[PDB]
From a paper:
[name]/[name] then unfolds [name] and any N-terminally fused proteins by processive threading through the central pore in an ATP-hydrolysis-dependent manner. Based on these findings, the current model is that [name] recruits [name]/[name] to the peroxisomal membrane and directly links it to Pex5/Pex14 and potentially other Pex proteins.
Using limited proteolysis on the cytosolic domain of yeast [name], we determined that [name] consists of a stable core region (aa 43–253) with disordered N-terminal and C-terminal tails. Without these disordered regions, the 25 kDa core was readily amenable to crystallization, and we solved its structure at 1.55 Å resolution. The core consists of 12 α-helices that fold into a compact, curved structure stabilized by a network of hydrophobic interactions. The crystal structure of [name] shows a single domain that we predicted would unfold cooperatively in one step. Consistently, measurement of the denaturant-induced equilibrium unfolding by circular dichroism exhibited a single transition with no indication of stable intermediates. Guided by its curved shape and the orientation of its longest helix, the core-domain structure of [name] was docked into the difference density above the [name] N-terminal domains. Building upon the atomic model for [name]/[name] proposed by Blok et al., this placement suggests that [name]’s N-terminus binds between the N1 and N2 domains of [name].
Residue numbers in the entry: 43 to 259
The structure:
Amino acid sequence: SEVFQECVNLFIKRDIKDCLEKMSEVGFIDITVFKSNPMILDLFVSACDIMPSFTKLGLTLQSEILNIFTLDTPQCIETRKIILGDLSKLLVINKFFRCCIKVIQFNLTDHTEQEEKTLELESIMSDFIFVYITKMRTTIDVVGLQELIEIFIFQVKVKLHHKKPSPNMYWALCKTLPKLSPTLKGLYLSKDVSIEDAILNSIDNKIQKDKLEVLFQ
């Protein structure tokens, strides 16, 4: 449609707030529309992933975004089934999780409620990780899987809990998901660099960044 093309054109120009406001104005931010038009959902998730947060937007747009990424709404449950159901598009699954994180991080004010939703997200994500490495064994998106685990560690365990990075976060996840380390050690981003190797290296770099970057400013 012409109106959908207008939204796409705003996205191409990185007028992301205007893109989302137009989607809201025309009624596209709606699970019923998402189910009937996969590319409308794809645009919505991609645009929301670029927004620093959802807090500076108009009230109507904000309420419609929150309905899609608040974990216990009917619309979020349905959207999650659609996005997590396409195991071939792991990078979009990762965008969706980042959008859920953005709601907890910036739209929630009560730390007790933030913790409550963070724990819910942890279960959703760890359950999905098991599904992915089981159902897509032999057909793993190595780069997407590295990104997924690093969202869990750096955005959820570190950022949402306000907790310093540690290799123990990786080993703890592997003890709850015993299939994980074998999978990640056997898949390679490059010669002699497994996903596990890369994640542990990322954790080490993040530790040094956390310790030193502000000192150097």
